[PDB]
């Protein structure tokens, strides 16, 4: 079947507790980014300049079309604070997977 | 589908006035890397603070914003006016279909997810 | 007629090689961003006050090229031939379609915006 690429932009905080429970749940793979990010959360002020750029984690993981759910589950639950900030996940079709070492394409390209 | 992410590659230099110039036509939401890259060969080499990159990477900007498909033009219009210089290495923007928009705090999912 | 990313996450010391071999075969245009990837190996171990600490994240580089779709598969060989060791994290390569590209500086579009100039 289909594979997608989730990519969640999260607190920096937040980056090792939804890697565990992430992996807890099979999803190991995953390629982690720093960025910078602005949304309604705003800026950083000081005092009374304006940082408007603030930290943020991008994680992608390429996963089945049938883990998406789970995946943006375990990310939502884990991430969340209910503060503005906490962040957006994106999934982005994903149309073919290659693994470098073996040339391996598919759903091998994801599996030991 | 609805939604669309656009991936802009830009000069260092430019990222405050674009930044500025969405944020101004209403686009807050966006996300920045910092990047380096090059562009298609020929032509008049590239130089980056004063010096020619005959081979090497130059460091670029990366902002991705994710809009509802109707944006896409007028975001990349605004990109290009505030970006462009007219010398090589100005940027190159690509546009991504974005299947599922979901906001971490609610769970909420599509144009809600990019609201208010 | 379309247009698509290949999107290569791959050793930080292999960035050199696949950038030349690349660009030797004439694909030129590319980004690159650092990263950090988990991989389903490991490894690393730490020790610290009698136990012992996995660290799971490792450096790696993203290169991420925007091609013609005839011209992905050549791409895909090229990276991995130059990327690969034949350890266990030499990296996977995806590829997401791309709509739409253009070229900030004249806007062009399309196949336009991905062409080389004169030499
Ligand atoms: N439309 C978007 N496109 C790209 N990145 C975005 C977008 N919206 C948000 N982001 C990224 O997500 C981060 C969090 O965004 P924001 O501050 O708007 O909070 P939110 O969690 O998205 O929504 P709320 O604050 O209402 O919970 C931003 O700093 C940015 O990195
Ligand atoms: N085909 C591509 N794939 C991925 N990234 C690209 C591609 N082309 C350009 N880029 C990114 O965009 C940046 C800017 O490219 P650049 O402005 O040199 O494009 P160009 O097509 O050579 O146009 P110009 O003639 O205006 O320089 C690059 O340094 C790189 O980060
Ligand atoms: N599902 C995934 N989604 C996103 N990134 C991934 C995924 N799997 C792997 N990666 C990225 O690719 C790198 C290589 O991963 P991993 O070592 O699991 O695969 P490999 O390189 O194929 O190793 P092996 O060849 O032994 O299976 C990781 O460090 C990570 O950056
Ligand atoms: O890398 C630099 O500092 C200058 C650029 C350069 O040496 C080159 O690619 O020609
Ligand atoms: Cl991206
Ligand atoms: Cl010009
Ligand atoms: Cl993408
Ligand atoms: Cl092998
Ligand atoms: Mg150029
Ligand atoms: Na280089």
């Not at 429970?21 to 910078?36: I, P, Q």
């Not at 949304?39 to 079309?65: A, S």
């Not at 997977?97 to 030991?112: H, M, N, P, S």
């Amino acid at each position: 079947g289909s594979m997608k690429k989730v990519e969640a932009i999260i607190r920096p905080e937040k980056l090792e507790i939804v890697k565990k429970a992430l992996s807890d749940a099979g999803y190991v793979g995953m390629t982690v980014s720093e960025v910078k990010g602005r949304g309604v959360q705003g800026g950083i002020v000081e005092r009374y300049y304006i940082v408007d750029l603030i930290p943020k984690v991008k994680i992608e993981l390429v996963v089945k079309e049938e883990d998406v759910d789970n995946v943006i589950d375990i990310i939502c639950e884990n991430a969340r604070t209910g503060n503005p900030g906490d962040g957006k996940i994106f999934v982005i079709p994903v149309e073919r997977v290659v693994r470098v070492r073996t040339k391996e394409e598919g759903k091998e390209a994801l599996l030991e």
